[PDB]
Structures are given as structure tokens and as C-alpha cells.
């Protein structure tokens, strides 16, 4: 039996479809039989008879499907047509400031993606704006900052691996940047210190340890992150930073047939593989699971290259089926219930052109129908985002249509004069910055309790996932008063996109010019 | 390094061009080669012989005028298929005939050869041995041993739906009353 | 079957013609059959039976055509007779100046080529002369420069790979030079930092990241780029800088048959290969695509050397066909519409002589006819430039015949008292420095609005590629007034070659002695 690619599997099997199936205690490779393998829940594999690794990543077609492989490669990448490689980004949890009286605020970071979008990971932090201290109006004064002073920056970060394969020795260099080009600091590549492993969906250091302090606390630089006054001013006006990271990962761990030992070979290095993957695969971005940008790469054919025409044709529907988990309970594409129709499709200009052609030779206008007839070629970039939410320039979830917001709140588990304890779908509470509470006189007056722009963070989350809104938090530590058992109590929510982040022209702090959506209005007696 | 080049080099470098139509004849002859010759002699002895057509099997003089109704065929895997698309059909009658559509991919792939061999086995069981009733107790004994055996997916591999529903062990009477199902297995 | 060059393909096949063709999923090599292969759009390859690599670059005749090759090698270089090698030059985006009140101007750079032209890359920057600030007349004063002072230079650069193969470890050393021989500084070769890849037609760092700051910003030298006064004066009169770069690239990425791994071999280095390529190929330079100098090398025969006579004879026509994309819709050589006749042919003195001979043994005088009968020999240098544009000494596009300039404007999409919104062919707006706007009294008077030499940059570009001329830019932020609905409004364009870069003898700022071409003239009511 011939086997040109020398990858264990014979030619015909690779081209036509095969599957590995354990017969009582021994595993053997078998040709796909439609009736006896399908009932057993086995996957139909296909691959290239002339590629030692169809995806082009460092694991052979045989190794992936048989399991003889580093047991850390994520499950969905065990399939021969999904490239397995790492994707490391930096998440900064909280910062602290002072002058070369310490502003210590918690930050939230999200992996970003913006628009002609290119293959390089970057993230984006947003510093909390709510006032932890009552008296700390205006940062410029809470820190005795003078025109000729300098502030010190001390943040905490962790590395997140959201890819599909482990990195071993190296840890990426990454540079912090404020504004368009003001590079505040480049985080050193610590040496001989990342002896641990970053398996997919893991943190370094783990959630159980103190996060890596950014400033050394040693003598390397007295204040490595110095920053003149003007920078601090820009930061005060924008409240957001960028973290750009490159792709210099470590070496690769390979499987040895002689004894089954997994050893890190010092010859093979991810900085040599990534270009191959990046030039011979189609890229799919999905924000379905938890509103985070998950990127996957599928091996697609490229007409211009002989060796490359060998790869099995990939129809979009199949790509979604094997890369992310979409399935067909009733033949209708859906991801744990949500039908494929609730998602947008966006394409880069090249791919766009190509798909308009594909839609022309098929005489169709709605891609959602002819979905299983769209061929993927190499180098297309596709972005599938939930159709229901509004999005900003960096493709982060930022807002939504009011109607969705209201239905998500129509289930009042309990209500009293101290707050509400709701049970809302975990995904929505990532586009709500806070709530405005107000009281309405029987004759139409309006009294807003937390009537300051920076006094909205009143909604905590209990250990049983029930959101609880506290009135006494940014009140006067006093319960809620009601002038009339006939007075309605109105509650408004403010979505991120419609929020204000700094005092206005004349330094207005009132929530007047903020677009507010009604979420609650009950009788005084009912509360 | 120099060693490996040789095998890949040989697999890829066709020294001479066989031709446009020769390949077809060589492919079909190689396919029929693997079946034991004695089957071919039995087939010829009972009459009709296999002829390889080149075009759309749906339209040939020998088959257009006969069995128009049986346009529905089931491949070896049990999935339906229409006769025009299918690449091989056979017919049992006074003139046993087998027709195969010529193609160049019988050596390279395997799923097509399986359907051809399936049809040769069907001719063998239904048209040759049936004249002597050769399938009998030994065959019934193995058959019966397959149904009753520890979680043996073997049944799924060889039995149709009709068989998986005969509650008791197989009986010599059943083969007589029903003889298409067994011949299929 | 014999096979001396030991490159997989047998002798007869290489000499006579062969082709690789994918048969459903298996790829095989076949001898060219004229009738059965031509309808399928397959290319007829030829090569040298005694050369492991006809081009002489590190990829075997077999690897190129089969696709087993670093997937980054540009498409046009997959053909066995086109050398694949890197061509790295430096592009400077903008500079800034001050004294050891900082003049920060944006720059434009073009890869250059001048005349007896040799194999070494150099570029040329031009600093913007237009006055960003109204009050910043005379640089000598905007910066408090004294006879005994020194100015500091701080620019941003990116590296550009316009070749056909990737560089891996190294990034080239490159020296900045003002004037003829005054070397201001040599930009260090950063060490172990260019771990990323420069695939052809890419930038380092990518367009999405901050460009590499030229000044270290560290303690290596307080102002590495010192520059005496006289130096600064030459710069003020000329606004031109040269960037010479050498060819010290990295190692080479090779293909491993055992597993299809592309590993950077530390033994092979481009600095050993380039000389071979440069002494055995004919070099063709073309500025057709986007008015940028694209250089390609084709393998041609050299009569004096036995082994070299083995290479397939190369006719000029085929060279253009396979190296750049020329084709024959109707048997007439053309590049996207433009017939071959719209281009000039210039030759170095050797090549000139040789081609004169070739035209003599055929008894023809117009090369555009006998194109398919011109043999290429090794070491010829040919320069094909667009015939329609005027050029300067460094073969950069600099001007054009007035008739073309006027014709390029005959499509007035809109006209009002606030400006024009045109849609012009992307190439022309690279030889126009600016526009002079004037209004004409019904009796022949002439009022020039922006009547200063350094006030021409009034044409911006909208995000849909529509050029927009703004009058209020270098006006008084006021709309355009007209003393008579019968008064004609005339607009003139000034091409680069005819522009002034410094005030005249008596410091004239008026546009008097500038050769201006009329581009528009509509009466007051025709707006």
C-alpha cells in the first residue's frame, strides 16, 4: 500500500475518509463505513495525501487523530483540519498611581480586534471610573501633581492563553502604549522564569497565585514607567490603554515514537511555523460563547499551488461544525440552541469579492440558505458576531437595542425597599455600566438618589449568581424612604455605549444628559 | 535525505504518457483481475457476459427496454441512489447481464471498486449458486452465530433492518421463504 | 532513468518540457502533451538538466513547481526560471528637529535607482516643505539655531521587503547620508530582535504598530545624530536625504522531506547566494504597476560557460510574460489594458551594444515588432519605464506632458464655492505638488488666493478615494467670495519638477516664476 506523505495513513484512506476506532483494547485505523461508525458517534476525517500535516502545524495527521500527541492540545484541534497553535495576550487586572495619596483603581481588559485586520494580538484595558472614595473628586488633586511633576505607574498583569497549543520556555515581550504612539514601557522578557506551562484557557500565573508585579521592586529602574504631566492629562481624558504583544513564543514539544516520551526539542520553534499557518488557512472569528473574540484557523485549498490543491474542500458549514461546535439536532445550524440566523457575517474586501462571485454562480441572495455550498479558499477572513448587540470600533460588545435589555429584566425574583435580587443571563451583564435610581412624586417630580456621573456602580453579584442592587452603597448608609404609598419607584439602566466618562463642559456631574432606558417602575405599596 | 527523494520522486514522475483512452481499459482489466477467475468461468458458463460501456449507464440498448421500474437502487452502504448517477447496474433474467461504466479511477480510489465487487457477489449468489442452492446449513450456521454474540457490531455491518427483527435464531425454513435477504448478506 | 542534477525530475523531461498537474487528490508530473494540457490552463515548464536550481537560488527545480517550498515565497517566483531573493530597503515616515519649537514634518520616501547602475539598494526621502504653521516662516528661526549650535534629529522608519523571498533573523545595517558624502549616522543593527518575518510586500513593524523609533531613547548616545551648522544649511537648501542599505540578510529557510518542516538552517546564509544569482541572470526593472521600481531577475544563458549553456533559451517576450504578468488576449502584449507600445526601453551600454547586434542579424529597426526574437544573455540590465511621464536623474516619476495633465481632469464630479470633489486615476496624484487658485475679473484681472510659495498643499483625499480641494484650508477659514456671477474662477496645477523648494534670490514667495498649467476655468454662475 502506497503512502507518499509517509504519515502512517495510506493514501486512499486519507483522501476518501477514515476513522480510528478502538476494538476492545487495541486501536486500529479503519475506512469509514457509513452505518457502523455513525451510530457510534465517530467523526469522519479527511486529509491531504501529500502533506505530513494537513493543517501545516507541527503534528502529523496520524498523531492528531490517534491521540499520540501532547495531551495538552485542546480537543477541538485534534481534528486534522484545524491548525493548533498558541495565542497569548496580556490581561491587566488593576493599577496604582502616585507621584515620583495613591490612586488604586481596578481595571478591566478585553482582547480586541479592529478593522484590513492583521495577524497580531493586542488587548485593551479600561480603568474603572466610579468613585471608590467620596472626597476624591478630580484625580489631578487627589495626587499632588504639579506641572513639573512625574507620576509612577504600577500595574498587575497575567498572561492568558486562548489558543490551542501550549507554550513552554519563552514568554512574550509586550509593550504598553497610551494614545496613538506614546510608548510608556516595554515589559521585559524575564529570563529562565517561565518554567511552567500555559495550556489553552489558562493563566500565568494561575488564578491561585499573586499576579506578576510589573515593577521589579529591585534596582533595575527607579521608576521605569515615568510619565510627564501631559501624558497623565491625556490619560485622564480618555481612561484607556493599549497592550500590544508580538508572537515570539518558545520551542515546540514533540512526541517520540520510540518510547512515548514528550520532550521539548530545541530545534523547532514556533516563530518558524506561524508564518506557514498564517499563509495557508482561512481564519474565522467568533464571539458566540462568552462574548470574547475566539479565533480559529481551518485548512482550505489554494488554487494557485499544486501541493496546496490537495487539501480536502471545506464548505463553510463544515468549518463551523468542526471548529466551534455548531451541530444539527434538526438539520438547522445552531450553537446550543441559538440558530445560525442570529449572527452577522462580515468579510475583508478580497473575501467579500470572492463570496459575491460564489453567490453569483449559485443564483442566491441569502447566505443563510446556501450555506453548505460556499467553498472556502485560502486567506479569507470571516467575522461572525451576534446580530443583537451594538459594537464599537474595536469590535468589542458595547451596547444593545433597548427592547432586549428590558426583556432580560422582566423576572423579578424579589423586591423590597433595600434593592432587587435578579437572575439575569450571564452574557447581558457585560454591556451595562450601572443603574440610575430615582423616585417619582405622585404628581410627577423626580429625585435621583445617586445623582453623580461617577456614582453608578451599585450593582453587585451574590455568590449564587443573583444580581443585587444596593441603594445604601452610594447613599448615606441609610435605607430607602418613600413619601407616599402611591408613589412610583423608577429604575433606569445605563449601557456602556451611552455613558459619560468625564465631567462635561461646565463640569456637570448630574446624570441629566445621559440617555437612560427604563427598567423598572413599581407602586410604593408593592415594594 | 538522498534516500527519501527516490520514493517521492518515483511516485510523482510518470516517465511516459500511457494515453487518453488506454488508462480506461487498463483500469477495468485490473479491477476484474482481483476476482477469482473461477467466478468468471462460472458466469460465462451460465450464459451472459459483462460488457463495459463508456457513457451514461442510464441509456444503453440492453437496459433501456427492460426493468424501467427499478430506477431506485441502494448502494452497499444502504443509501438510495438513482440509476443514471450510479456507475454500475446488473440484471437477472434469461440473459444475465452485467454492465460497468468505464472510468479511470478504479485503481486509485476504493469506494467505487467496492460497489463493483458487491455486484459481482450479487451475481454469484443470486444467479450462479442459486441454480444449485449452494447457500445452506454451513452458511446458515455462521449466519446464526453472528446474530447471537457478545455486542458484536458485526450484525450492523452485514444485516439489514429486516434481519435485526427476527427474534429467535435463524431457521432453515426462513431461507426458503425469504431468499433475497440472505443472498444480500 | 538517469538524472545527473539529482533534483527529482528526469533529464529528458527537464530539457523538453513538463508540467505538474493535480489528478483529483494526488499530484503527478507529466511530459507536456500539446493538445490535452493546453485547454486546462497549465504552464509549460523548462529547466536545466545539469543544475539543481536553474535560477541558482536555494530552491530546487522540483520544489518550486511542486509547491513543496516555504509558503511565503511570492507566487511569481514559483516558476523555475525566476530567482527568488530578498530586497530590503528602508522607508522613513517623518522626522523632527530641535536643538541639543521642534520642527516635526512628515516625509515621503521612494526607492530609487540611478544611472551604469549597480546591485545595491538605496532610497531617497523628501521632506515636506509646506507650512503646517502660519507663523513658522524660515526654519532657521523657528529653531533657535546659532552659529555655534547643533541640532538633534529624530525620525521614524520602517523596513520594506519588496523582493520575492523572506528574511528571517537579521535586519540590514543602513546609513543615512546628506549631500554627496556627509554621513550623519549609521542605524545600528539591533541584535536578536527581528524574530518576526518580512514576507514580500510587507512592512516591519506592520502598518498597525508604532514605527521603530530611530533615536534609541536610551543612554547609548545623548544625540547620536549630531550635525554642525553648515550641515543644517545644506539640508535647508535641498530637503533631500539618501538611505544606503547593504545586503547582509539572515539565514535561509529550507524544506525537510521527512516531515515537511520548514526550518531555518543556520549553515546557509543569503550573503553567500546573492553573488551567484547576480552574476548569472538578466535583470529587468519595471515601474508599471504603481509607479514604483520593481526589480526581477530571470535566468539567461551565458555563452562562455559550458554548464551555463544548459539553461533554456530565454526570449524577452516570455520573460515579460512570466515575470510580471503581461499576457496575450489578442496576441498583443499588454499589461492590464496598456499595450506594450506605451513603454520605453533603456539599456546599459553593454546590453545596448548587444541588442544592436541582435537587431542587425534580423534586419529590423523597431524592437516592438521583433520582440519574440530577442535572446537574453546573462548580465543584461533592462529598464522599462512608462513612456508618458517625465523622469528625473534617479528615475523617479517627476512630471508629465501638459496634455495628459489636463485630460486627467476633464471629469468634474461636482463644483461649488467650497471646493471640488473629483475621482482621478490613483497614479496621477503622485506627480502634482499642489494647486494655485485664482479668480478673474470680467476684465482680465487676476487675484491669487494662496499667493505664497509654501502654501500649495490644499488637496486632501476622502476615504472613498475622491480628491477634495479645500479653499478654507489656507484661506481665512472663510468660504470663497465672488465679485461677479460672471467672473471666471481659474485653477492651475503645479507638477513636482516645476516646483520651488526654497525662497528665491530676494526671498520671493510669490508664484510668479513657476510654470503653471491651467486645469480649471468656470465662470461664477457655472459653479
Coordinates of N, CA, C and O in Angstrom, one line a residue, chain B residues 1-2 4-5 8-9 11-17 20 104-105 108-109, chain C residues 1 6-8 10 13 23 26-31 33 62 68 257-258:
Chain B
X1 N 18.7 11.7 3.6 CA 18.0 12.7 2.9 C 17.9 12.3 1.4 O 16.8 12.4 0.8
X2 N 19.0 11.9 0.8 CA 19.0 11.4 -0.5 C 18.2 10.2 -0.7 O 17.7 9.9 -1.8
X4 N 15.2 9.4 0.8 CA 13.8 9.7 0.7 C 13.4 10.2 -0.7 O 12.3 9.9 -1.2
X5 N 14.2 11.1 -1.2 CA 13.9 11.7 -2.5 C 13.4 10.6 -3.5 O 12.4 10.9 -4.1
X8 N 9.5 9.4 -3.2 CA 8.6 10.5 -3.6 C 8.8 10.8 -5.1 O 7.8 11.0 -5.9
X9 N 10.1 10.8 -5.5 CA 10.4 11.1 -6.9 C 9.7 10.1 -7.8 O 8.9 10.6 -8.6
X11 N 7.0 8.2 -7.1 CA 5.5 8.3 -7.1 C 5.1 9.4 -8.0 O 4.0 9.3 -8.6
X12 N 5.8 10.5 -8.0 CA 5.4 11.7 -8.8 C 5.8 11.7 -10.3 O 5.0 12.2 -11.1
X13 N 6.9 11.0 -10.7 CA 7.4 11.3 -12.2 C 6.9 10.3 -13.3 O 7.7 9.4 -13.8
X14 N 5.8 10.5 -13.9 CA 5.4 9.5 -14.8 C 6.2 9.6 -16.1 O 6.1 10.6 -16.8
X15 N 7.0 8.6 -16.3 CA 8.1 8.7 -17.3 C 7.5 8.9 -18.7 O 8.0 9.8 -19.5
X16 N 6.4 8.2 -19.0 CA 5.8 8.3 -20.3 C 4.2 8.4 -20.1 O 3.7 8.1 -19.1
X17 N 3.6 8.9 -21.2 CA 2.1 9.1 -21.1 C 1.4 8.0 -21.8 O 1.5 7.8 -23.0
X20 N -4.7 8.9 -23.6 CA -6.0 9.4 -23.2 C -7.0 8.3 -22.9 O -7.7 8.4 -21.9
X104 N -11.5 6.0 -15.0 CA -10.0 5.9 -14.8 C -9.6 5.8 -13.4 O -8.4 5.7 -13.1
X105 N -10.6 5.8 -12.4 CA -10.3 5.8 -11.0 C -10.7 4.6 -10.3 O -11.2 4.6 -9.2
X108 N -7.0 3.9 -8.3 CA -6.6 4.9 -7.3 C -7.6 5.0 -6.1 O -7.0 5.0 -5.0
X109 N -8.9 4.9 -6.3 CA -9.8 5.1 -5.1 C -10.3 3.7 -4.7 O -9.8 2.7 -5.4
Chain C
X1 N 16.1 5.5 -15.3 CA 16.2 6.8 -15.9 C 17.3 7.6 -15.2 O 17.4 7.7 -14.0
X6 N 20.3 15.4 -10.0 CA 19.8 14.8 -8.8 C 18.7 15.7 -8.1 O 18.7 15.9 -6.9
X7 N 17.8 16.2 -8.9 CA 16.8 17.1 -8.4 C 15.4 16.5 -8.7 O 14.4 17.3 -8.7
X8 N 15.3 15.2 -8.7 CA 13.9 14.6 -8.8 C 13.4 14.4 -10.2 O 12.9 13.3 -10.5
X10 N 13.5 13.9 -14.1 CA 14.5 13.3 -15.0 C 14.9 14.2 -16.1 O 14.3 15.3 -16.3
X13 N 12.6 15.1 -19.4 CA 11.5 15.9 -19.0 C 12.0 17.4 -18.9 O 11.4 18.3 -19.4
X23 N -4.3 15.5 -10.2 CA -5.3 14.5 -10.6 C -6.0 14.3 -9.3 O -5.4 14.0 -8.3
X26 N -4.2 13.5 -5.9 CA -2.8 13.1 -6.0 C -2.1 14.0 -7.1 O -2.7 14.1 -8.2
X27 N -1.0 14.6 -6.8 CA -0.3 15.4 -7.8 C 0.8 14.6 -8.5 O 1.6 13.9 -7.9
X28 N 0.8 14.7 -9.8 CA 1.8 14.0 -10.6 C 2.4 14.9 -11.7 O 1.7 15.8 -12.2
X29 N 3.6 14.6 -12.1 CA 4.4 15.3 -13.1 C 4.3 14.5 -14.4 O 4.5 13.3 -14.5
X30 N 4.1 15.3 -15.5 CA 3.9 14.7 -16.8 C 4.6 15.4 -17.9 O 4.8 16.6 -17.9
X31 N 5.0 14.6 -18.9 CA 5.6 15.3 -20.1 C 4.5 16.1 -20.8 O 3.4 15.6 -21.0
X33 N 2.1 17.4 -23.2 CA 1.4 17.0 -24.4 C 0.7 18.2 -24.9 O -0.1 18.8 -24.2
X62 N 12.5 21.1 -8.7 CA 11.3 20.3 -8.3 C 10.5 21.0 -7.3 O 9.2 21.0 -7.4
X68 N 6.2 22.3 -2.8 CA 6.9 22.0 -1.6 C 8.0 23.0 -1.3 O 9.1 22.8 -1.7
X257 N 12.2 17.0 3.8 CA 11.3 16.0 3.2 C 10.7 15.0 4.2 O 9.6 14.5 4.0
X258 N 11.4 14.7 5.2 CA 10.9 13.7 6.2 C 9.6 14.1 6.8 O 8.7 13.2 6.9

